[PDB]
Amino acid sequence: KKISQYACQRRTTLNNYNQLFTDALDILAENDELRENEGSCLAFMRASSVLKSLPFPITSMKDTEGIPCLGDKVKSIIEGIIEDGESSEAKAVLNDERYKSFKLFTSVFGVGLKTAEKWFRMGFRTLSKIQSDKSLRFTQMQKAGFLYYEDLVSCVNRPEAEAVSMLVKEAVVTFLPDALVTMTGGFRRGKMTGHDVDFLITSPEATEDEEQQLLHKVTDFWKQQGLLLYCDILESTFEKFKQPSRKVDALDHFQKCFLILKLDHGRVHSEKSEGKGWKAIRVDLVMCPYDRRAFALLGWTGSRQFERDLRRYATHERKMMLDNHALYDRTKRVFLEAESEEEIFAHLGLDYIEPWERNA
Ligand SMILES: [Mg+2]
Ligand code: NA
């Protein structure tokens, strides 16, 4: 049939037949993001997203006809890939100093764009010069980022993700035996590796008081045992009767905590049977009211592009407003309920897309 411009109306599995085009596009998009060039960035991400969706590899400019999200700027890039087999534009970004530095400083936990720019403009070009400079000052988060840099740069496996899962369940079960813990993000979509492990937590019979304290308890608990290397808890900013905004910002979120846990090797059951029997792992935990679990899961399952298109689809095609906490129908003036992701898709009039099919 016809290919939708919306990723939420496309099935995108991990079988990418267009990695050559896709990698160059991701690099160009990333470059624009690091430069805060919104428009260009999103254009590159949309184009890369549609190609990942293809069931065949592009081998001529003709195979492009009919596909949306491919402007003249992008087709020029597709063109070069068809020929050389590589992109001179992507190549240029990979050798760009600002790009190299930002990506490097940014690979440090706690280092955002403002901090990266600062260091770049001071002349810094390597992590070593940064760490040894006896004049710079770092946030608590950045210190932790440097302290465990090595483990954090190392991808996280499914085996490690599952061991982390077990830890979370053992803790959470201790304060809410009826708590539901779901692994979200990349791993839920079937990925083999990730830079961190995310989880959604909810309790059927928890009180507004209980669900609000669980994370503090679980984290305290890990502190007592020395498993907590870094912890930051942000209180929920979601309001029960407030409808999702025009995406004004993402300051709307449930209670969550950015953590770094000490993962003992002995708890990891992989086909790899030492030195320092543990590994630091980035872990994000999210707690939400039982009745909003479907929306949170949908939101945290990603991918980012899938989440972006789900939202604009809802707004531009169905006059609905979507959030990690709700779905509002502006036409019928009512909030729509959902006990599962499928119901949410039904409400939007969208055929259900499985998690492993959301790698847009
Ligand atoms: Mg995360
Ligand atoms: Na970072």
Q: Give the ligand whose atoms come closest to the C-alpha of residue 304.
A: 1
User: Tokens 């050798």 label which residue?
Assistant: 95
CA angle (170 as vertex; 165, 175 as ends), nearest 5: 125
Catalytic residue check, 196: yes
Helix, coil or strand: residue 228: strand
C-beta contacts of 63-70 below 8 A and 24+ residues apart? 66/2, 66/3, 67/3, 68/3, 68/4, 68/5, 69/5
Residue-wise DSSP of 131-147: HH-SS----HHHHHHHH
In CATH, the architecture of 1-95 is Orthogonal Bundle (1.10)
**β-pair type (197-202, 278-287):** parallel
Catalytic-role residue among 198, 252, 309, 323:
198
Ligand that comes closest to the CA of residue 200: 1
Angle (deg, nearest 10), helices 38-52 and 72-84 = 50
Q: Determination technique for this PDB entry?
A: X-ray
- Given 23, 26, 96, 284, the catalytic residue: 284
Cα 277 to its chain centre, rounded Å, is: 28
Q: How far is the CA of 103 from the centre of ligand 2 (A)?
A: 9
Determine the residue type at 1. K
Rounded CA separation 301/284 (Å) = 13
Which residues, in sequence order, are CB contacts of 307 under 8 Å at separation 6+?
A: 299
**Do residues 101 and 116 make contact, with C-beta atoms less than 8 angstroms apart?**
yes
Judge if 96-154 and 155-290 fold alike in CATH terms: no
Output the CA 306–ligand 2 centroid distance in Å. 22
Residue 175 annotated as part of some ligand binding site = no
**190 appears as a binding residue in the annotation:** yes
Does the annotation flag 330 for ligand binding?
Answer: no
Residue 232 annotated as lining a ligand binding site: no
| Distance, CA of 185 to CA of 197 (rounded, Å) | 7
Judge whether 32 counts as a catalytic residue: no
Q: What is the resolution of this structure in A?
A: 2.4
> How many CB atoms lie under 10 A from the CB of residue 274?
5
Neighbours of 266 (CB within 10 A): 10
Q: What is the DSSP letter of 194?
A: B
Helices (H), the chain: 19-34, 38-52, 72-84, 88-95, 97-106, 113-121, 127-132, 140-147, 149-153, 158-175, 185-188, 208-224, 293-301, 304-318, 341-348
| CB atoms near residue 276 (< 10 Å) | 7
Three-state DSSP class for residue 124: coil
Q: Is 265 annotated as a binding residue?
A: no
Which residues are within 8 A (CB) of 356 and not within 5 positions of it... i.e. 6 or more apart? Answer: 13, 14, 189, 190
Q: What is the CATH number assigned to the segment(s) 291-359? A: 3.30.210.10
CA 129-131-133 angle, to 5 degrees, is: 60
Q: Which candidate, 280, 290, 43, places its Cα nearest to that of 160?
A: 280
- In total, the chain counts a number of residues equal to 360
| Closest by CA position to 303, among listed 92, 10, 38 | 10
Does 264 carry a binding-site annotation? no
Q: Are 287 and 202 in contact (CB under 8 A)?
A: yes
End-to-end CA distance of the chain: give it in Å, rounded: 19
Task: Give the neighbor-by-neighbor strand order of the sheet with 334-335.
Answer: 320-322, 327-329, 334-335
Ligand 1 centroid–CA 334 distance in Å is 31
Domains of the chain, by residue range, sit at 1-95, 96-154, 155-290, 291-359
Q: What is the DSSP letter of 345?
A: H
Starting from the edge strand earliest in sequence, which strands make up the sheet with 197-202, in order?
A: 180-183, 197-202, 278-287, 255-264, 228-234
Q: Indicate which ligand has the atom closest to the C-alpha of 257.
A: 1
Q: Which CATH architecture has domain 155-290?
A: 2-Layer Sandwich (3.30)
Name the strand (E) or helix (H) holding 183: strand 180-183
CA–centroid distance, residue 80 to ligand 1 (Å): 35
Q: Count the Cβ atoms, other than its own, within 10 Å of residue 70.
A: 18
Q: What is the largest CA-CA distance in the chain?
A: 62
| Distance from C-alpha of 186 to C-alpha of 242, rounded to nearest angstrom | 29
DSSP state, residue 294: H
* Topology (CATH level 3) of domain 96-154: DNA polymerase; domain 1 (1.10.150)
In the reported structure, the alpha carbon of residue 105 is separated from the centroid of ligand 2 by a whole-number distance in angstroms of: 7
Q: Are 286 and 296 in contact (CB under 8 A)?
A: yes
Q: Name the one residue in this structure whose structure tokens are 């999702």.
A: 244
**282 alpha carbon, closest ligand:** 1
Measured at the alpha carbon of residue 222, what is the angle toward residues 296 and 285, in degrees to the nearest 5?
A: 10
DSSP 2-28: PPPS-GGGS-B-S--TTHHHHHHHHHH
Q: Write down the catalytic residue from 196, 252, 309, 323.
A: 196
Omega within 30 of 0 (cis) for the link into 88: no
Residues 6+ apart with CB under 8 A from 350: 8, 9, 313
Active site residue 23: no
Burial class (CB in 10 A: 0-12, 13-18, 19+), 265: middle
User: If we measure between CA atoms, which residue out of 316, 311, 317 comes closest to residue 252?
Assistant: 311
